[PDB]
């Protein structure tokens, strides 16, 4: 989820 | 186009745009022509304390090792962020599923970090704090275990990796190949990532022929370094576990927690 977020 | 000319160029430019450190800059700081005053040598606790005093000035009840360990983590979180932007600039990567993107980075980033670490390491030690510090190889070996065992494998790897005498263009394509790997566990759209990797490796082969005409066996040497990295990571993941379990004031950063979960 923090990794989802960086790919924003 | 699909043209490998524009693939190499776009990857080299995404590499220069997105990484604070690289080999050219590293070589310039280590010759002493980057600043009026060269990097601060950290070789004992005396100098480590001067260095922390001036470059951070907030953690003096927490043990030296625990603070150095905090710093390793801060640097990974930064480089993971640079790598995600770098990834996003690789032709084709933007067009992948979000879940495939997460996977490729989850397994990609530590291989990439150790590959790029090599650029800031010589036989004597490594640049830290955005090029402002030089922590000695020996000072790191002379920490209490298990912390003195982190970097030593990375120096071993980097010493041989650096002997290949690659430049930043060669390294840009090499990081791109690490990230776009079709056999990561969990990958959904394997066939499209395999085709993407086939292209990068291909332009990498072509790039090495023209850029390194002397070393005819350089391409197979680099493919082997990618296997070697995959195994440097597993051993490091294992060593970071020992530390999570057997060390109180060393709670891993939450981003690195996700990355290490279910890993190997
Ligand atoms: C732990 N760190 C992280 C850093 C960092 C930076 C830039 C500089 C630093 C830094 C500079 C001096 C330090 C000195 C220290 C230390 C840690 C640091 C330190 O622990 C003990 O003495 O960008 C991302 O993360």
B80, B81, B98 ranked by CB distance to A4: nearest = B98
Distance CA B225, CA B160 (A): 9
Closest-approach residue (CA) in chain A for B255: A2
Radius of gyration for chain B, computed over Cα atoms and rounded to the nearest angstrom: 19
Residue B132: domain span: 1-264
Find the helix packing angle between B190-211 and B218-246, rounded to 10°: 120
Report cis status (omega within 30 of 0) of the bond before B146. Answer: yes
Instruction: Pinpoint the alpha helices (H) of chain B.
Output: 4-18, 23-31, 45-55, 64-88, 98-117, 137-141, 152-163, 168-179, 190-211, 218-246, 254-260
C-alpha separations of A8 from A2, B10, B81, B169 in Å? 10, 21, 11, 27
Q: Are B90 and B14 in contact (CB under 8 A)?
A: yes
- Cβ B59 vs Cβ B153: under 8 Å: no
- Radius of gyration of chain A measured on its C-alpha atoms: 4
State phi, psi for B127 to the nearest 5 degrees. Answer: -70, 140
Q: Which residues pair with B42 in a beta bridge?
A: B135
A2 neighbourhood in chain B, CB within 8 Å = 254-255, 258
Q: How far is A7 from chain B (nearest CA, A)?
A: 7
CA B8 centroid distance within chain: 20
Nearest chain B residue to A7, by CA = B84
| Phi and psi angles of residue B125, each rounded to the nearest 5 degrees, phi first | 150, -170
Geometric angle at alpha carbon B169, from B7 and B263, rounded to 5° = 80
| Residues B12, B16, B20, B24, CA torsion sign | positive
d(CA B103, CA B179): 9
Sequence ranges of the binding site of B for indeglitazar: 76, 110, 260
Q: How far is the CA of B49 from the centre of ligand 1 (A)?
A: 11
CB contact under 8 A, A4 and B80: no
- Within 8 A by CB and 6+ apart from B98, the residues are A4, A7
- Distance of alpha carbon B106 from alpha carbon B157, whole angstroms: 21
> Which residue is it, tokens 């292209």?
B199
Beta-carbon contacts of residue B77 (< 8 Å; ≥ 6 apart) = B253, B255, B256
Experimental method: X-ray
Query: Which DSSP string do the residues of B152-211 spell out, in sequence order?
Result: HHHHHHHHHHHHT---HHHHHHHHHHHHS-TT-TT-S-HHHHHHHHHHHHHHHHHHHHHH
Our count of domains for chain B comes to 1
Q: Which residues line ligand 1 (CB under 6 A)?
A: B 48, 51-52, 55-56, 67-68, 70-71, 74-75, 78, 129-130
Q: Within 13 Å, how many C-alpha atoms sit on residue B109's CB side?
A: 26
Is B210 within 8 Å of B230 (Cβ atoms)? no
Nominal resolution (angstroms) = 2.8
On the 0-12 / 13-18 / 19+ scale of CB atoms within 10 A, B58 is: exposed
């Amino acid at each position: 989820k923090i990794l989802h977020r960086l790919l924003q | 186009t699909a043209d490998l000319k524009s693939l190499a160029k776009r990857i080299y430019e995404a590499y220069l745009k997105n990484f604070n450190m690289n080999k050219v800059k590293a070589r310039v700081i280590l010759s002493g022509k980057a600043s009026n005053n060269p990097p601060f040598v950290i070789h004992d606790m005396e100098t480590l304390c001067m260095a922390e005093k001036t470059l951070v000035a907030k953690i003096q009840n927490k043990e030296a090792e625990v603070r150095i360990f905090h710093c390793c983590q801060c640097t990974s979180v930064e480089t993971v962020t640079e790598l995600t932007e770098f990834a996003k600039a690789i032709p084709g990567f933007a067009n992948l599923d979000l879940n495939d993107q997460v996977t490729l980075l989850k397994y990609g980033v530590y291989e990439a970090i150790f590959a790029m670490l090599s650029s800031v390491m010589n036989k004597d030690g490594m640049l830290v704090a955005y090029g402002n510090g030089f922590i000695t190889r020996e000072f790191l070996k002379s920490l209490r275990k298990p912390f003195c065992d982190i970097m030593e494998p990375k120096f071993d790897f980097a010493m041989k990796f650096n002997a290949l005498e690659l430049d930043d263009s060669d390294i840009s394509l090499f990081v791109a190949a690490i990230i776009c790997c079709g056999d990561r566990p969990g990958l959904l759209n394997v066939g499209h990532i395999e085709k993407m990797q086939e292209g990068i490796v291909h332009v990498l082969r072509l790039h090495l022929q023209s850029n390194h005409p002397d070393d005819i066996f350089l391409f197979p040497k680099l493919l082997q370094k990618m296997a070697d990295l995959r195994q440097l990571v597993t051993e490091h993941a294992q060593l970071v576990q020992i530390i999570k379990k057997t060390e109180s004031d060393a709670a891993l950063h939450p981003l690195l927690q996700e990355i290490y979960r279910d890993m190997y």
